[model samples]
Target: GLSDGEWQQVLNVWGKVEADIAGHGQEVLIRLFTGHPETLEKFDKFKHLKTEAEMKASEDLKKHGTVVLTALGGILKKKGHHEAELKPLAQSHATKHKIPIKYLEFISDAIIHVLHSKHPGDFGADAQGAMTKALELFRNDIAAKYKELGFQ
Candidate 1:
């Protein structure tokens, strides 16, 4: 759970993020792939595309990126107690997607990077710190769910 101060920090900057969820989402994915090329293999839509230009122009990439950000937005709106929201996502990644839990870390890192790069003034240390804590809890929930489903 986030402290009251941390929650306020995140809430203050969430509107900026929500304003361009899809674009920011795409940026996050791009950063993730740039840092961890192997992550591209997890996405059938993106795995075939080599180079940043190809990924940038991909409709499928944009669509999935929108979905990822939309999911994060939903989690943020909840404030806390995210188990209900995270369970299905965890299950899908564990079984259907065959995605390793470590990728969540990659995605989270990319998200923070995109936020800071996109809004240096608005997303200063406080907001970034709050988001880092919040996302860590989100990741922990998903990881716990994965364990419950017997997927390592």
Candidate 2:
């Protein structure tokens, strides 16, 4: 949980790097797939991309990366207003996508990494604290749905 002020900082810091989401999103996914090849097993679409360039060359990966980054952007704008927007996504991730909680956590790690890389000195610690809580909330919501569906 973040204080209202903390969440506000999240939004402010996001504005710093949101402009480069496409590039950063691709970067994050590349980092994930490159650093942990096993993580790709969850996605039939992305699993075949054995190299960073292959993933970058993938429009499917690009589109999906946009969605991933956009959903994360939504969190800063609407944390409390988020559930209605994200619950269906959480459902699919749990019920249909069958994505493990570990994958979601991996994405969370990538989110933080991107922020750090994209913003560098401009990314304030308060923003990090705020996004840390925000992503925790997002992760918890997803995990809870999995729990409800008896997946976790």
Candidate 3:
């Protein structure tokens, strides 16, 4: 949990970024693929795109990007256990999509990169740390939820 001051800062920084929701979302998704292309294959819709450029430019990217960024924006606005929002998705990915809990960790880097890139001036070290702290909770909960279903 952030101090009231910390919360104020994060939400304020997020507001600056979230104004361009699609742009923020698309860039994070693109960064994840750029860093670890293997992650792209996990998405059947994306795997066939055959290149990062193709994937990023597509309508599917636009749709999913908006969703992910919008969700993150929601997290910035809300309180208590951001992980709570992730557990259900973890279950679905574990069972249906066959997503590796291991891979989810990279998303933290992806968004952190986007946040820093988007707000070079306003998002200072403390703001960055708060964002990372919040994302770590998301990653941990996702892994725990995925493993709880008895997969090794």
TM-score, cand. 1 vs. native: 0.94
TM-score of every model?
0.94, 0.90, 0.86
The model with the greatest lDDT is 1
What's the number of clashes in each of the models? Answer: 0, 0, 0
Candidate 2: regions farther than 4 A off: none
lDDT by residue for model 2 (5-77), tens: 9888878877865787777778778778877777788788888887777888988887777788887787658
lDDT of each: 0.86, 0.80, 0.76
For each candidate in turn, give its C-alpha RMSD to the true structure in angstroms. Answer: 1.2, 1.6, 2.1
Model 1 spans with C-alpha error above 4 angstroms: none
TM-score of 2: 0.90
lDDT of 3 by residue, 21-132 (tens): 8888788888888788888888877777777778677887878889877876776676444666666677878898887866767877888888878777767888888777
